[PDB]
Design a protein around this ligand. Sequence first.
Ligand code: EDD
Length: 337
Amino acid sequence: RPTFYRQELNKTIWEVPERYQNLSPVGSGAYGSVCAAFDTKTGLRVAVKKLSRPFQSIIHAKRTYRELRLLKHMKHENVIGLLDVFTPARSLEEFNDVYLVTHLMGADLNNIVLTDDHVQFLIYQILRGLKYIHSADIIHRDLKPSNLAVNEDCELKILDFGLARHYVATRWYRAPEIMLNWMHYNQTVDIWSVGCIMAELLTGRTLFPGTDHIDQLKLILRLVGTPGAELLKKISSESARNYIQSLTQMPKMNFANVFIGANPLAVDLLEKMLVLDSDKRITAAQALAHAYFAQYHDPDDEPVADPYDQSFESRDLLIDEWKSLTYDEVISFVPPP
Ligand SMILES: CC(C)(C)c1c/c(=N\C(=O)Nc2cccc(Cl)c2Cl)n(-c2cccc(CC(N)=O)c2)[nH]1
């Protein structure tokens, strides 16, 4: 039973425990908003995410539940972890609000903008966290520089703000198979994104700054070329395949000529990540074993996730039921050691 306080920031009432103080707005979108706070029970600086009308729809109530489940599951140095989760409501019937708390880590990756050595370490930690996440049958799906928390010492956490924002456009970092619904995507959609980030850290430019999905694809195929017969027949979507079949043929660009003056090991890795056929794209675990990361690679300290129960994903429930599952998850939360 902590003593909560009401307070209003920017738009909305935040009712949170007394321990958290000096809430400062950092982010708002359709799905919620984040503040920095000080936590007086630890002395450390936190992010406090308040979801907005968590249970306003089915899709929202499940999204809410999902986030709570994911964040509770994540126990990795290179991925966001849950310090606290709370609600004012002292009953399920009262429960309308969910606040998530985490260890604030400072800038994100585009604000933190870099030696080639920095690039290795950062891209190494991305892949390290990604190997973990992928090990739980989780696809991040929105991996861009704003969803990477980096501190003073270039230590990195993967997160997802997931606020619905309106600027780092998620399409800039999206693999074309998930962007244009070519086919049944896999986890390597995240590898593509890491490729774009890596590129960007090295050149300072966004790799593919497309203005929409059509421009996006244009820009992509300029570099990687248009798909051949082989990949074309993997685009199981006919409308998507017909569109591709109609584009002007583009040759793959030799990346050594594109990423001029880059560690040739970084170029080679790029080539392996920025593969259009996700059947051929390097994976997280494999990429960690690349020579680009020799200074960091340690197969003995590149850990995998405990088993993540996503049976719920196959459920069609009512708002009230998603809301009760969420509630259960809040009460069963036990903090960090
Ligand atoms: C990296 C990983 C595990 C895929 C992840 C972290 C996360 N949530 C956050 O990272 N939230 C967050 C971000 C910044 C500050 C604070 Cl306090 C939080 Cl709780 N995720 C997340 C964010 C929003 C919604 C969902 C659920 C969904 N995808 O429908 C998950 N996803």
